[PDB]
Amino acid sequence: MNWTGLYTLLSGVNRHSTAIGRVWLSVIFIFRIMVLVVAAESVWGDEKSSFICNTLQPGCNSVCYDQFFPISHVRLWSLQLILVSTPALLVAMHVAHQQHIEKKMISGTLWWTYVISVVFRLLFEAVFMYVFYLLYPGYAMVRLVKCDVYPCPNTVDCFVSRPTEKTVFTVFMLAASGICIILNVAEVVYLIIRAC
Amino acid sequence: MNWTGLYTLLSGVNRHSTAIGRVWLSVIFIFRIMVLVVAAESVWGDEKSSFICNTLQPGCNSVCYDQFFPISHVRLWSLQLILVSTPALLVAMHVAHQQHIEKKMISGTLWWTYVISVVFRLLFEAVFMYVFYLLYPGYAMVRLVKCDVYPCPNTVDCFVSRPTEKTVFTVFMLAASGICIILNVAEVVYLIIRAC
Amino acid sequence: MNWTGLYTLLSGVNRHSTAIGRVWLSVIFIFRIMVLVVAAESVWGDEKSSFICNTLQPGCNSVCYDQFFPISHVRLWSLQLILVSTPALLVAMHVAHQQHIEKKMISGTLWWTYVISVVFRLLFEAVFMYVFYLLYPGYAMVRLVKCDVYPCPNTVDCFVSRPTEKTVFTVFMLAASGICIILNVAEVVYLIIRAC
Amino acid sequence: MNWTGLYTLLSGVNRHSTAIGRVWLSVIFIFRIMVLVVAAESVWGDEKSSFICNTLQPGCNSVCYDQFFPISHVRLWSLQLILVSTPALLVAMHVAHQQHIEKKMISGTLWWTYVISVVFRLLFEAVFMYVFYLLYPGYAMVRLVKCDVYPCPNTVDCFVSRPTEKTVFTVFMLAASGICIILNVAEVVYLIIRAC
Amino acid sequence: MNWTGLYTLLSGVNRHSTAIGRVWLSVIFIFRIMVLVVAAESVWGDEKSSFICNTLQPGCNSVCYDQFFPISHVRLWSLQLILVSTPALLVAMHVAHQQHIEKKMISGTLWWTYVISVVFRLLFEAVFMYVFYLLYPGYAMVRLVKCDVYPCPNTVDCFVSRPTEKTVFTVFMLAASGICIILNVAEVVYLIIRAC
Amino acid sequence: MNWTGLYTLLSGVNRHSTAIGRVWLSVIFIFRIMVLVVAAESVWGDEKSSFICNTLQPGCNSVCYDQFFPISHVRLWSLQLILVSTPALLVAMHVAHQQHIEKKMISGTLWWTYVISVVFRLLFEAVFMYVFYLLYPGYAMVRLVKCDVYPCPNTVDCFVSRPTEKTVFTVFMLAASGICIILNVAEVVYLIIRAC
Ligand SMILES: CC(C)CCC[C@@H](C)[C@H]1CC[C@H]2[C@@H]3CC=C4C[C@@H](O)CC[C@]4(C)[C@H]3CC[C@]12C
Ligand SMILES: CC(C)CCC[C@@H](C)[C@H]1CC[C@H]2[C@@H]3CC=C4C[C@@H](O)CC[C@]4(C)[C@H]3CC[C@]12C
Ligand SMILES: CC(C)CCC[C@@H](C)[C@H]1CC[C@H]2[C@@H]3CC=C4C[C@@H](O)CC[C@]4(C)[C@H]3CC[C@]12C
Ligand SMILES: CC(C)CCC[C@@H](C)[C@H]1CC[C@H]2[C@@H]3CC=C4C[C@@H](O)CC[C@]4(C)[C@H]3CC[C@]12C
Ligand SMILES: CC(C)CCC[C@@H](C)[C@H]1CC[C@H]2[C@@H]3CC=C4C[C@@H](O)CC[C@]4(C)[C@H]3CC[C@]12C
Ligand SMILES: CC(C)CCC[C@@H](C)[C@H]1CC[C@H]2[C@@H]3CC=C4C[C@@H](O)CC[C@]4(C)[C@H]3CC[C@]12C
C-alpha cells in the first residue's frame, strides 16, 4: 500500500494528467467511495423493510415504496461512480496496451483520448446530477409521503426511515459531485490553454 | 494492483488478442461484474422475503414466487458471467501449460484455439440472451402479478419488490451483454480478415 | 495473481500430470467452486426459514425439513469438493516435502502416488454421486411434499423454497461432476497407456 | 505488514512532520478506527430496529427515531474520521506527485502546505465536536425519551437500545477526539516555534 | 500462495518433524478447518432461533436451549482447534526467536520441546474428545427433547433444528479428531524409536 | 505470512524484549483474539434480540437488558485488547521513528520506554479485570434475572440467552487475562534483575 504505488494506481500511469486531475480528482473520488461505503448498508440498509404505510391493504407497502423510490440513492450513486470511473479505466487499459505492444516490438493520440475521457467524465457527472434532480426534486427527504397507487385505497400515509440522515448524506454526495464537475471543467480548460 | 499486472491478468497473456479484445471486452466485463456486485445483495436480496400475495392460503407465497421467478435475474447473470469467462480461463490455462512444458524442455494452434474461444464466448452470450427472453418476456417487471398455481385458490394478487429498480438494472445488464455480443462478432471478423 | 502463478498453484508442481489433468480438471474444479459460491448463500440461504407446512402443530416445520433434507445440497457439494481436493492436497504436500528434504541434503514413487491420487479422486466422485442419488432420487425438486413424521398429525403438506432454481443448479453441479468422472477415467487410462 | 512499511504509510512520507504527529496522532487515529469498527455494527446495529414507542400509531416509531437521532453517532464519527483524514491524504498525494514530476525531470511549499493541513485537521475536529454537542447535548443517553412529533398523538414514551453502552463509547470517542485537538494545537505551536 | 510457502508455513520451520507430522497432520488440520468453516454459520447458524418448545411459557425456549446445549458443537470444535494449534504456535515462535537471537549474535532443546508439543497436542485432543462425550453422550442428535427446567411447567417438548445434518458433521469432526489422535501417537512412538 | 515475518511483526522490532515477552505474551494475545473472534458474533450476537421478559409492558425488554448489561462482555474484552495493545503500538511506532530519523542522518531511552510500556500494559490488564468484577460480580451468568426498573411494573422475570456458553467463554477470557498479568509481572521483575 506504498504511497507511490497508490498514486501510480490512481493516476493511471498517464503522462498528460495535470496536478488537479492527479491529486484533487482522485481525493474527491476516494472521498465519495468512503462516504458511500459507510452509508450504503448502514443508512439505506432498511430502506424498504422499515418502510410502512398506515393501511391494511396487502401489498400497499411494496407498491408505495416502488412508487416513491424508483431506484435507491445508494444504487444511483454506485452507478454514477462506476460510469464516471469507466473512461479512466479505458485510458488506463489503453496505456497498458500501448506499453505491451511497444515492449513486443502516439503522444498526440494519448493527449486526445485523455481529453475525450475528461469530457465524457464531465458528461456522466452532469447526466447523473440531472437524473437525481428528476427523480428526487429538491435535496431533503420527508418523513411522511402520500401514496395513492393501486392497490392502495384512496390515499395512504407512508413513513420513510431516517429521512434526516439520508438528507445529510445526500448533501454530502451532491456537494462532492458538484466539486468533481468544477474540477473536470477546470481540467478541460487548463488542457486546452496549455495546448496552445 | 499495478496497471500492467491487471492488464496482463485480464489479457490472459495471449499474443493473438486484438485491441478490442484486450481493452473494450475486458472493461465491459469489469463493468458487468461491478454492476452485478452492487445490485446482487442490495436489490435482489429480499426478492422472496418481500414477495407477498393477497391470500390466507399457507404456502401460496412460496409457490407463486417459484412460478414467476424460476431463477432469479442475479443468479442468471452470475451463471452467464461464469460461462462466458470459462473459454478465456481455458485459453489462459492452456497458454500457461504451454509455457510450463517449453520451460521443461504452436502459434497456429494458439490462433485457432483463441478463435474457437471467441466463438464459444459469443455463443454463450447469445444463448443466455435467448434464455433471459424466454423466461422473462420483455424487459420491465410489473408490480402486480396474477398467480393461480396450486394450492392458491382461484387467482391471487402477488406483489413484487422493487420492480422499477430491477428494471433499471435489467436494462443495464442487457445493454452490456448486447455490447459484448457486438464486440465478439467484430473480434471474429477482424481475426478472419487479418488471417488473409 | 499471475497466470503462471495460478497455473503452478493448481497443477500442484507435479511432473507427471498430463494436459487434461493440468487444464481441464482444474477448470472444471474452478467452475464447480464458482457455481457453488454464487448458489450457496443466495439460493439455499433460506432453505429452512422459508420451509413451511400447512399445519398448526408446533415443531412440524423443523421435523419435516429434517425428514426431507437430511443434508442440504450445498453442504453435500461442499464436502464433495473438499474430499475430492484432498488427494491433490496430499500430493502437493508430499512434493513440497520431497523438495524440502532434497534441499536439506523417487520418480517412480511420485508416479505411483499420483496414479493412486487420481484413483481416489475418481472413487470419491463416484461415491458422492451415488450418495446424492440415494438421498435425493431423481434430479428435480418438487414444490409440495407430504410429511407424516411425528409430531405432525396424519400427513401434512410442506412447501419447498425455490425448487426450480435449485433444480437448475443441481443439474449444473451433477453435469460438472460427471465430466470430472469422465476426465479422471481418461487420465487413468492415458497414464497406464503411457506407462507401457 | 512490516512495521517500517506501516510507519511509512501512516507518516505519509512527509519530511516536516514531528515526533508527535508521526507517532501519537497516528496511534490515536488507529485507536479511534478500532473503537469505531468494534462498536459500529455491534452496538449501533439495532439502533432503529430495537427502537420502540408505547403507542399503537403506525409510523410513530420511525418518526420518533428520526426526531431524536437525526444522524447516528457511528455515522457522525465515520464522517469525522474521513474529513479529518482528508488533508493528510491530500498532502500524501501532493508529495507523491512531486516525487513523480521530479523523477520525470519546494521545501518551503511542503512546509506551508503541511502547516495548513494541520490547521484544517484541527478545524475539522473542532467543528465535529461542536456539531456533536449541538445535536446531542451532554454525553449520556437516556433510556426513555418523550416524543410528540406528528403523527404520534400527544406525547409518547420511546425507548432507546443500549443507552449505557452507547454512553461508554461516546465518552471514549469524545476523549480521543479531544486528545487529537490537543495534539494538533501542540503540533502547530511546535512548528511555528521551530520555524523561528 | 506458493506450495513451498504454504508447506513452510504449516510445518513451522521445524527440523525434527517427520513425514506424518508435516503432511498428514497438516492435511487433516486443514480438513477440519474447512469442514468447520462450511458448517459453522450454515448448519449451526439458527441453532437457537429455530429452537422452539410446545408451550406458552415465556422464556421456556431460551432456558431449554441452554439446558440441552451448554455449549454449541461449533464453538466446542473451534476451541479444540485453537487449543490443539497452540503448542504448534509456541514451537514456531520459539524457533523464530532462536533464529532471531542467533542472527543477533540447541538441537536437543528443539527436539525435546517438539516432543512435549506433540504430547500436549495429543492430550488436548483426548480431553476435548472426552468433554464432547460428557456433554453429548452418543453421536446422533434427536429431533425431540423433553425439557423440565424452570420456568417451564412440568415437561415440555422442544424441537432441534437440522438434527440429521448436525449428526453428519458431528461424525465427520469426530472421525477427523480420532485420526489426529492416532497420528499423534504414531508421531510420538516414531520419535522415541528414532531417538534410540 | 512467513514465520519470521509474523515474529518480527509481533515482537515490534524491539531489542529489549525477553523470551517471555516475545513468545508467551504474543501467543496468549493471539489466543485471546481468536477466542474473541469465534465467540463475538456467534455467542453474543443475539444477546439483546433473544433477551425477553415475562411482561406486557412496552419497553421493559430494552430497559432491563440495559440495566443488567451496561456493556457487553465482548465489547469489554474488545476494549481491553485495544487498550492493552496500545503501549506496544506506541513502542513499535517510536522504534520505527528512530529508525527513520537515523536513516535520515538512545539504548537507555528504548529500555526505559519499554519498561514503562510493560508497566502500563500490566496496569490496563488490572484495571479491566477490576472493572469486569465490578460490573459482573462472580464469573457465572444466570438464566433468570429479576428486573424492577421503570417502566417495568413491580419486578419482572427476564431470561438471558446462552448463559452457560457465555460462562465458559468468560472463564477462558478471564484465565487468559490472568496469565497475561502474571507474565507481565514476571517480565518487569526479569528486566529489573537484568538491569543490575
Ligand atoms: C483519477 C481517478 C478518477 C482515478 C480512478 C481510478 C479507478 C477508476 C481505478 C483505480 C484502480 C482500479 C481498480 C484496479 C483493479 C481492480 C481489480 C478488478 O478485478 C476489478 C476492478 C478493480 C477494483 C479496479 C476498479 C477501478 C479502479 C479503482
Ligand atoms: C478478456 C476477458 C474476457 C478476460 C476475463 C478474465 C477472467 C476470465 C479471468 C481473469 C483472472 C481470473 C481469476 C484469476 C485467479 C482466480 C483464483 C481462483 O482461485 C479462482 C478463480 C480466479 C478468481 C480467476 C477467475 C477468472 C478470471 C477473473
Ligand atoms: C487439479 C485440481 C484438483 C487442483 C485443486 C487444487 C486445490 C486442491 C488447492 C489449490 C491451492 C489450495 C489452497 C492453498 C492454500 C490454502 C491456505 C490454507 O490456510 C487453507 C487451504 C488453502 C485455501 C488451499 C485449499 C486447497 C487448494 C485450493
Ligand atoms: C497521521 C495520520 C492522520 C495518518 C492517517 C493516514 C490515513 C489518512 C491514510 C493512511 C493510508 C491510507 C489508505 C491507503 C490506501 C487506500 C486504498 C484506496 O483504494 C482507498 C483508501 C485507502 C484505504 C487509504 C485511506 C487513507 C489512509 C488510511
Ligand atoms: C502441523 C499443523 C498442526 C500446523 C498448524 C499451523 C497453525 C497452528 C498455524 C500455521 C500458520 C498460523 C497463522 C499465521 C499468522 C497468523 C496471523 C495472526 O495475526 C493471527 C494468527 C494466524 C492466522 C496464525 C494462526 C495459526 C496458524 C494457522
Ligand atoms: C507482544 C504483543 C503484545 C504484540 C501485539 C502486537 C499488536 C499490538 C500489533 C502487531 C501488528 C499490528 C497491526 C499492524 C498493522 C495494522 C494496520 C492498521 O491499518 C490497523 C492496525 C493494524 C491491524 C495493527 C494493529 C496492532 C497489531 C496487531
Numbering used by the authors:
A (entry chain D), B (entry chain C), C (entry chain A), D (entry chain E), E (entry chain G), F (entry chain F): 1 to 105, 128 to 218
Please, what does the article write about this entry?
Connexins are transmembrane proteins which assemble into hexameric hemichannels (HCs) at the cell surface allowing the exchange of small solutes (ions and molecules of molecular weight below ~1.5 kDa) between the cell cytoplasm and the extracellular environment. There are 21 connexin isoforms in humans, with distinct tissue distribution, channel properties and regulatory mechanisms.
Once we saw that Cx32 reacts so dramatically to 2-APB, with a substantial rearrangement of the N-terminus, we were convinced that the choice of 2-APB for our study was clearly favourable. The NTH, flexible in the apo- and MFQ-bound forms of the channel, changed to a conformation closely resembling the NTH conformation in the Cx32-apo HC structure. While binding of phospholipids to site A may stabilize the NTH in a closed conformation, the functional properties of the site M have not been investigated prior to this study. Our results suggest that drug binding to site A may affect NTH-mediated connexin pore gating.
